[PDB]
Design an enzyme around this catalytic site. Structure first.
Site, PDB file in Angstrom:
ATOM      1  N   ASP A  72       0.837  -1.195   0.000  1.00  0.00           N
ATOM      2  CA  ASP A  72       0.000   0.000   0.000  1.00  0.00           C
ATOM      3  C   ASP A  72       0.876   1.250   0.000  1.00  0.00           C
ATOM      4  OD1 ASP A  72       0.790   0.045   2.812  1.00  0.00           O
ATOM      5  OD2 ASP A  72      -0.853  -1.367   3.151  1.00  0.00           O
ATOM      6  N   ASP A 141      -7.167  -5.946  14.767  1.00  0.00           N
ATOM      7  CA  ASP A 141      -8.513  -6.470  14.423  1.00  0.00           C
ATOM      8  C   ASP A 141      -8.410  -7.500  13.311  1.00  0.00           C
ATOM      9  OD1 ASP A 141      -7.713  -3.866  13.141  1.00  0.00           O
ATOM     10  OD2 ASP A 141      -9.301  -4.402  11.730  1.00  0.00           O
ATOM     11  N   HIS A 143      -6.950  -7.217  10.370  1.00  0.00           N
ATOM     12  CA  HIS A 143      -7.025  -6.662   8.995  1.00  0.00           C
ATOM     13  C   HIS A 143      -5.667  -6.766   8.296  1.00  0.00           C
ATOM     14  CE1 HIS A 143      -5.271  -2.931  10.532  1.00  0.00           C
ATOM     15  NE2 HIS A 143      -5.180  -2.506   9.274  1.00  0.00           N
ATOM     16  N   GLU A 148     -10.499  -3.269   4.621  1.00  0.00           N
ATOM     17  CA  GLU A 148     -11.410  -3.225   5.751  1.00  0.00           C
ATOM     18  C   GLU A 148     -11.372  -4.560   6.495  1.00  0.00           C
ATOM     19  OE1 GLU A 148     -14.653  -4.017   3.459  1.00  0.00           O
ATOM     20  OE2 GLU A 148     -13.463  -3.382   1.727  1.00  0.00           O
TER      21      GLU A 148
END
Lengths: 258, 265
Positions: A72, A141, A143, A148
């Site tokens: 990213d 979480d 991810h 998301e």
């Protein structure tokens, strides 16, 4: 799935760097047949990059014919800005090994069309065939990258708005000002990660304990790794606090067996 | 709740026997003020009784003023039968220590009224006040004594049908015939066990790992989870029994109980 339960972050860094080097030397890449490597950013990958540099300085590996794809990059932030992912990768890795600029691939978050830039990246991946090894991290979480938490397993490279949790975390890099963190990013999809021959996930810290448990024991995007042909998770002792005793015990003996 | 994570079954036997002896010597029982002890049967309690016998032969403990109450007993089976829990307790414990016959209490499964016998048992417990320490085991499914899996937490001593899983088990003791296992038993209730001042549960073996996880980590549900509502519950386990616990759970109790771990290491 393989779980490598190590003691501390230094051992996780050395093991993950040694695994990458061993595969590159087993592959023996050339100009015609390069080794394709997926790469993440962050505090935990940083220690692997330092360990990879130590192995390069030791003459143990060459990245001349290694092609890289990063996960990213921020949108709207100049690539020359010190806090861009381009700057992270060059400052902490590329500037210290014999990688070739034309073999480096990082998403451009300042193109004329963000959608077109994301599809170009996907096509540059396909032009090489497949990524041989994709290294990554996991969030608290579960991810992956900037996808998301509840991303589809078929998701591909696209532009994403940063969640409120990612803005406050990454705010330490932008003068502790959440309003200075870029609001958007281009990120590879979950399907992009799963298409690689191998995925190696680095999981360290107490705050990653639930994520590691979901990845290894649960039926949380990281749970998609359970259906991947060749998944490797390298963790430290604090990251294992939520795993069952039998899970850590089995993999601790399996690795000592190798 | 206390969890004592030990290595093997022998250490579970030695620690639990030493804990019983230390409490008896801390209590200093007399005729007027006896030490009241609840007792189970089975393979895992058997090693504790063997360890208790060695401590008795060493002069470390006397059971002269110890009053005992057993968890359960088969209905319709003569007490002289080799597979009765009367025979188990005498052959493996009572015949080897200085306990007094009148201080032994075991449910009689052949009285004229099973309800009356169970009520008498509860009254006999109350006449002493409370059981100071109730030792017990646990089933693979978390059950206690012969209480059904969904037993009330206030249940008292009563006659019960053995569950189908309890019937197929224990069949090895009755000629490998499920139809020859006694279909009923008298058993203390969950409330009966919870009234004791202290409860010590012995949990060994891989097959008890799911039961230990429900007892230590699960929410109150698995009869053994009732221990979570007790004031002073102690669980003594070996390493195979901890296989289903979370790493942080074993990590916490290994450091907390490190002095008890070192005492039998």
């Amino acid at each position: 799935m393989r779980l490598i339960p190590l003691h501390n972050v230094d051992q996780v860094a050395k093991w993950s760097a040694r695994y990458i080097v061993d595969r590159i030397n087993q592959f023996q890449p050339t100009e015609a047949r390069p080794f394709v490597l997926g790469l993440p950013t962050g505090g935990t990958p940083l220690k692997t990059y330092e360990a990879l540099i130590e192995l390069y300085k030791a003459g143990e590996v060459s990245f001349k014919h290694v092609v890289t794809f990063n996960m990213d990059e921020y949108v709207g932030l100049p690539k020359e800005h010190p806090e861009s992912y381009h700057s992270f990768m060059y400052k902490n890795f590329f500037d210290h090994v014999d990688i070739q600029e034309k073999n480096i691939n990082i998403l451009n978050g300042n193109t004329e069309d963000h959608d077109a830039e994301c599809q170009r990246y996907e096509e540059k991946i396909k032009s090489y065939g497949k990524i041989h090894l994709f290294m990554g991290g996991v969030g608290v979480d579960g991810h992956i990258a900037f996808n998301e938490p509840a991303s589809s397993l078929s998701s591909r490279t696209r532009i994403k708005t940063l969640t409120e949790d990612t803005l406050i975390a990454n705010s330490r890099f932008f003068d502790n000002d959440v309003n200075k963190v870029p609001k958007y990013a281009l990120t590879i999809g979950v399907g992009t990660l799963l298409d690689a021959e191998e995925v190696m996930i680095l999981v360290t810290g107490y705050n990653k304990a639930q994520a590691l448990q979901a990845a290894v024991e649960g039926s949380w995007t990281v749970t998609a790794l359970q259906m991947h042909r060749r998944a490797i998770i390298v963790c430290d002792e604090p990251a294992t606090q939520e795993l069952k005793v039998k899970t850590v015990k089995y993999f601790t003996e399996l690795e000592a067996s190798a």
